[PDB]
Amino acid sequence: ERPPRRKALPPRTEKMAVDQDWPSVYPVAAPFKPSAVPLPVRMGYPVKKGVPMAKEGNLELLKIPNFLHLTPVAIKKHCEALKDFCTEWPAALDSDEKCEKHFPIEIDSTDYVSSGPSVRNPRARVVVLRVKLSSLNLDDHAKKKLIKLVGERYCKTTDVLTIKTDRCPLRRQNYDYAVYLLTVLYHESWNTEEWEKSK
């Protein structure tokens, strides 16, 4: 033991200036490091005539998912760098009514972000297609036949046809199937069969 037991250096928070660039200290999400956070933050239910425990060796603070990497300064700086990637919403589509006129169909899909080694989620395949029958070129006969073919998929109050598809493994296959069903429904509604005279 000619050199004595290695001594821990003093914490580097004592070298930090009060006007530092904090986003540089915590660039990404990292666990709470008491030697790097220059705050006398205490945590822990105090014992009688006691104070909340100090930050060094404090397992309660380690458990907290801290937001030291997302200080308001960092978020504003981050988004300034991310503006280059964004594209501008069409100004014409000011209101929801204007969106419906130009783009009658709405495709709903869902992505699930969970923690674990596998990203797979069987719920992500579901695709919902909604279209108002007033946006479709349907005559009187066709509209009546369509409403009968789809059944409960049609809502009279809203006049929206909801086609949910989840047969195929992938979302892209369910999207193609939903679009296909709308096509064959449209064309079958227009077709008039001889047995329809028995109505």
Binding site: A8, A30, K33, L59, K63, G116
Partner: protein
């Protein structure tokens, strides 16, 4: 009398940490959870596999760092990442710590097929919350 995870009062000479001093009825009230993942949220899958992995990791780290851990692990999962936060003592030489961090991070990444990081916090001695 209830027993679960209750350090029983002694002659006032036994040091206990903050985690060890709080009985199970204090979880979510005075102490938090030692593992954070989404398995146990409503509508989330694979709670069973997350549980087994946690039990293994706590044992692996106990044997790989024998006599070093001064408090329970804090397992964190963010997406694909696994982060092990360990409060260790300042007895083992730094060289041996760096070897074990590189070894444990690599071996566990290949075992659970995911990026694993180990964040060691060193304390001079066990942090005593109270003496029971």
């Amino acid at each position: 009398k209830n027993r679960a995870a209750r350090v029983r009062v002694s002659k006032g000479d036994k040091p206990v940490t903050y985690e060890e001093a709080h009985a199970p009825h204090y979880i979510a009230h005075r102490k938090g959870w030692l593992s954070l993942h989404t398995g146990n949220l409503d509508g989330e899958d694979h709670a069973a596999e997350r549980t087994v992995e946690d039990v293994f990791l706590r044992k692996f780290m106990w044997g790989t760092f024998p006599g070093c851990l001064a408090d329970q692990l804090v397992l964190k999962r963010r997406g694909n990442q696994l982060e092990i936060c360990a409060v260790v003592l300042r007895q083992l030489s730094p060289h041996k710590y760096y070897f074990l961090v590189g070894y444990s991070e690599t071996l566990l990444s290949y075992f659970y097929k995911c990026p694993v990081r180990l964040h060691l916090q060193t304390v001079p001695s066990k942090v005593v919350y109270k003496y029971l």
